[PDB]
Amino acid sequence: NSRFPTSII
Amino acid sequence: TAVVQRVEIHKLRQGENLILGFSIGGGIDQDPSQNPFSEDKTDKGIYVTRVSEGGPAEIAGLQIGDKIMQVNGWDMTMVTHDQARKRLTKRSEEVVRLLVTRQ
């Protein structure tokens, strides 16, 4: 989802 | 319906960085309606959106969909996405304890 950004950590 | 879990992640060095082996979504600056993991679509909390097979988070017991309530005692319920990211990735911290809830 373009509108649900996620970040890898 | 939700159960509290406490996990203790030991970060893995990957080059210059210490990594945790998972991904997050959410935050008070984001659109909570787009979070597929929450029960309440106004929930602006930080959720685990992916877990790396064999990584530190998996070994520690973290699971996709977990809601992160605290990191090393720091409240994660009303933070921006970037604040959450920064709290999880302090270069000085090799061990991070997460308080999560799991549906």
The domain B1-103 is placed in CATH, from the list 2.30.42.10, 3.50.50.60, 3.90.1170.50, 1.10.760.10, at 2.30.42.10
**Resolution of this entry in Å?**
1.5
8-state DSSP, A5: -
Residue B88 forms contact with A (CB below 8 Å): yes
**C-alpha B64: how far from its chain's center?**
9
Is there a contact between A9 and B88 if contact means CB atoms under 8 Å apart? yes
Closest by CA position to A7, among listed B43, B96, B89: B89
Output the CA–CA distances (angstroms, integers) from residue B15 to B19, B20, B33, B92, B98, in the order listed. Answer: 10, 13, 36, 15, 24
Contacts of B13 in chain A (CB under 8 A): none
Give B33 to chain A, closest Cα distance, Å: 9
Q: Which runs of consecutive H residues, i.e. helices, occur in chain B?
A: 56-60, 81-88
Output the CA–CA distances (angstroms, integers) from residue B95 to B29, B40, B43, in the order listed. Answer: 27, 31, 27
The CA distance from B12 to B38, in Å, is 28
